[PDB]
Amino acid sequence: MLEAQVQFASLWKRLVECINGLVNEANFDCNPGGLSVQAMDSSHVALVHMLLRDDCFVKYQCGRNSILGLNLASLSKVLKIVDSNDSLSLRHDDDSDVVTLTSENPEKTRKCEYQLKLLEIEAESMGIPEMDYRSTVTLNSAEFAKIVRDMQVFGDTVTIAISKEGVKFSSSGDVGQGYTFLQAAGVEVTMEEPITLSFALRFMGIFAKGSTLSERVTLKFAKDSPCMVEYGIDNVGYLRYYLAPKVD
Amino acid sequence: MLEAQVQFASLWKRLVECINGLVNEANFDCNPGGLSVQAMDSSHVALVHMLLRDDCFVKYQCGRNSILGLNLASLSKVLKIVDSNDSLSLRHDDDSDVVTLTSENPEKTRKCEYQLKLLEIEAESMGIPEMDYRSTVTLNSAEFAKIVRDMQVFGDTVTIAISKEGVKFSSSGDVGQGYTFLQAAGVEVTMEEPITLSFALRFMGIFAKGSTLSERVTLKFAKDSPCMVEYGIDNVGYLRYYLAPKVD
Amino acid sequence: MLEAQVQFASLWKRLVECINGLVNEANFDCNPGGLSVQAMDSSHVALVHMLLRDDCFVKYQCGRNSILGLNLASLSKVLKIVDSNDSLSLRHDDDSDVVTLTSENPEKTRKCEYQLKLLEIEAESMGIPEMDYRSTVTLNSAEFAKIVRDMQVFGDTVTIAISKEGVKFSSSGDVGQGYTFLQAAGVEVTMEEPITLSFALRFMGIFAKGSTLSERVTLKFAKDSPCMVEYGIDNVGYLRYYLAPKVD
Ligand SMILES: N=C(N)c1ccc(OCCCCCOc2ccc(C(=N)N)cc2)cc1
């Protein structure tokens, strides 16, 4: 038996949208100590790790690890119809091919239950990059999102430059060339070396949807190494993305 | 001859929008009692009956029964460009071939007038499915619309089950299966007996636009009988839908 | 060689949208009196003339008249991603083959800079029409914009009839006939004679977007003559459109 109730469905809604943007199916590693989702785009260029610790749920009951694989396409379609202010309980009875989502009015006047079928999803082949990040920049989630959208009016790749002075996002295409410089503090830059890597704006966009979860976003970079985009879900979880640098 | 001035065009705007979306053309039964529209889908599964009693208009003048046929498509377009807070005088003259919608601002500083050509539409073979309903449910028009839209993510058929306890809406499909139960009281139920019938969501959605006209909606049900979705237009008229169940 | 900064980019964002509506490339006559675009549509029936005077900018510098060709398409695509309340400094150095738009935060914490390639625009046949205007209707900018959107539901040609009582905009088509009458007083008419011209609505629509720059619009008319449609920019310049009568 499994049960995770959240006070506000908004979290699940704002979460699945962030993930469905990268992959359309994923396995929910529901183990005691929290609910984890790990997955890679078909390009094998970009990975999402999502942890929700057990302190995140008003009710959480996972005695033994049970992996549940799920169609994010369907799940997303169901969550769209669930009022955010309503409660949401995700429940699985052992040896079921379906998992149950239950929502209730704060008033208890209305109850909605939605049953979705489970899938068989093979375990992610690749795993979190084992890297120590030299340069770390933190900035307002929404500003990050705007910048990617903006840089995309120019090209499909963004050249991020970390410097003591601040980060410079730059891009070029037919429309022409542009850049956005963010003066460091507010932009909290931590640097050991002046690092400057380039990344695919398509994925950066997918990531930026994290603005729905956290007011600020931590971007961690390492020379000739994947990047991490971390979104903190309060101190009750996190959403982390990893993307490959563009190389010549 | 005919003259039907309403103080606020909002009504006509909302009504035509509702009636359109089941039918493209309709005859306006201009009787000295009021205006009436009776019509049926191409599928001939769904009927719409609308009554606007003379009390609804600030100036009704229909000495004799005139049947005016109109393209709801063309009417909807002309109405979309009319401020709802403006007057709307519908008018026809002997053998005019055209109807005249006239609109004025409260300040009488702006006058808009539009002329639409009448169509010849044959009378409706089917008649109001006059019947007595065992069970009668009233709820918030808006919640109804939400429920129909929500159930439409699962399937195209809705199963309504009426119990002293309350009303549950069930739908199934590839996405999976979901249900929304409403606890009886503002859910006002009224069952001389328990009943559970299934309907097409497509036509339910067409009806659910009645919310723009009324904050509550009354649903009447009889076994192996068309249902009725009623929306009261103040005390000046009503909009009624009747739809054939699905039985196996 | 040229620098022109404005406090709020709102103007540029609102201006380019207006003039990108009519033409995709335009030359900017930069000179010490200010910036000036004068362009015709390809059909040669419509002419836009825009003047921003030096006092429009918080900082203007143009010793020598240079002509700059810009792709209003690209310029549009850039200004879309510039915050209204950020400042915008348009600059050009001797034989640079690009202009630089530079965007500063009020708080100076963010700097965006974009470079657009300059075009060689050959069209300069534009000759401001003589202005012996007899009639001068002036009305709310957004009402004129609505009237044209509305008249488009009927036809693609509008007939403006100016009389002592007020102005009538008439249109006809498959949907039917329509007209909006605005009585004089805030409609301010000024005629020497009853005048009635007809005009293409496609262009009147392009012009109407001027409502973003001015709370009021001025239409000037003369028999057999192009009308003028003038949007005042705050006494620091203008946006004027001229359109050939369709009575030809
Ligand atoms: N460079 C010059 N000295 C010059 C050359 C031509 C010109 O033209 C005057 C009449 C026509 C241009 C005034 O605006 C239009 C445009 C198109 C039509 C049409 N084709 N219906 C009607 C009126 C004015 C000045």
Nearest alpha-carbon partner for B214 in B230, B228, B190? B230
DSSP assignments along A28-71, one per residue: EEEETTEEEEEEE-TTSSEEEEEEEEGGGSSEEE-SS-EEEEEE
Q: Do C74 and A175 touch (CB under 8 A)?
A: yes
| Residues of A in Cβ contact (< 8 Å) with C77 | 153, 175
- Least Cα distance to A223 among A200, A197, A243, A204 occurs for A197
d(CA C218, CA C231): 7
Between vectors from CA B192 to CA A112 and to CA B139, what angle results, nearest 5°? 40
Of A245, A235, A242, give the one whose Cα is nearest residue A40.
A242
Q: Distance between terminal CA atoms of chain C?
A: 45
Chain B residue with Cα closest to A79: B150
Tokens describing residue B54? 């003379």
- Cβ under 8 Å to B: C residues 144-173: 146, 149-150, 153-154
Q: Which chains touch A (3 or more CB pairs under 8 A)?
A: B, C
The domain segmentation of chain C, as residue ranges, is: 1-248
Candidates C77, C98, C115; nearest CB to A153: C77
The full length of chain B comes to 248
* Vertex C105: Cα angle to C103 and C107 (nearest 5): 155
Alpha helices in B156-241 (DSSP H): 201-208
- Alpha helix segments (H runs only) across chain A: 10-20, 72-80, 141-152, 201-208
CA of C244 to the centre of ligand 1 (A): 9
Widest Cα–Cα separation across chain A: 60
The SS3 call for residue A142 is helix
Distance from CA of C248 to the nearest CA of B (A): 26
Q: Residue B206 is encoded by which pair of tokens? A: 């067409």
Answer whether C19's CB lies under 8 Å from C79's CB.
no
Q: Scan for tokens 């192009």, then name that residue.
A: C226
How many whole angstroms separate alpha carbon C183 and alpha carbon C195?
16
Measured between CA atoms, the residue of chain C closest to residue A146 is: C81
Measured from the Cβ of residue B52, the count of other Cβ atoms closer than 10 Å reads 24
**A216/A195 Cα distance (integer angstroms):** 21
Q: Which atom number of ligand 1 is nearest to the Cα of residue C242?
A: 14
Name the residue type at position B96: S
Choose, out of A148, A168, A183, A189, the residue to mutate when testing the contact with C (most C CBs < 10 Å).
Answer: A183
Going from the Cα of C27 to the center of ligand 1, the distance in angstroms, rounded, reads 19
The phi, psi pair for B119, rounded to 5°, reads -105, 160
Residue B143: CA count within 13 A, CB half-sphere: 22
Give the DSSP letter of residue A209: G
The answer to whether residue C74 neighbours chain A at the CB level (below 8 Å) is: yes
This entry's atomic model was obtained through: X-ray
Give the span between the Cα atoms of A198 and C6, in whole angstroms. Answer: 33
> Which tokens in the block code for residue B28?
């306006």
Ligand 1 — pocket residues by CB below 6 A?
C 44-45, 127, 129, 226, 244, 248
A43 and C CB contact within 8 Å: no
Instruction: State the closest ligand 1 atom to the C-alpha of C40, by its place in the atom list counted from 1.
Output: 16
Put simply, the answer to whether C111 touches A180 (Cβ < 8 Å) is: yes
Look-up of token digits 């199916």? A25
> Which of C149, C177, C183 has the CB atom closest to B114's CB atom?
C177
Q: Is B234 within 8 Å of B226 (Cβ atoms)?
A: no
Q: Give the Cα-Cα-Cα angle A82, A85, A91 (nearest 5 degrees).
A: 55
Residue for token digits 């005019």? Answer: B96
CA-based R_g, chain C, Å: 19
Q: Exposure pattern of A145-178 as b/e (b: 16+ CB <10 Å)?
A: bbbbebbbbbbebbbbbbeeebbbbbbeeebbbb
Chain A residues touching B183 at Cβ < 8 A:
108-111
Please report, as a single letter, which amino acid is at residue B145.
A
The tokens 């010490």 sit on which residue?
Answer: C32
The alpha carbon torsion through C63, C66, C72, C78 (nearest 10 deg) reads -50
**Chain-chain contact of B180 with A111 (C-beta, under 8 angstroms):** yes
- Centre of ligand 1 from the C-alpha of residue C24, in Å: 21
Structure tokens at A177: 């060339």
Given a contact cutoff of 8 angstroms between Cβ atoms, the answer to whether C230 and C239 are in contact is yes
All residues of chain A having their beta carbon less than 8 Å from the beta carbon of residue C81 are 146, 149-150, 153
The DSSP 8-state label assigned to residue B246 in this structure reads: B
**Burial (Cβ within 10 Å: 0-12, 13-18, ≥19) of residue B69:** middle
Phi first, then psi, for residue B172 (nearest 5°) are -130, 155
> Closest Cα of chain C to B173: distance in Å?
40
- Distance CA(B110)–CA(C166), nearest Å, equals 10
Residue for token pair 């979460």: A15
For residue A220, the distance in angstroms to the closest alpha carbon of chain B comes to 38
- Is some CB atom of chain A closer than 8 A to the CB atom of C104? no
Distance from C-alpha of C71 to C-alpha of B239, rounded to nearest angstrom: 54
Of C108, C111, C114, the CB nearest to A176: C114
Partner C contacted by A142 (CB < 8 A): no
Q: Rounded to 5, what percent of chain C is helix, strand, coil? A: 20, 45, 35
* Closest residue CA from atom 22 of ligand 1: C244
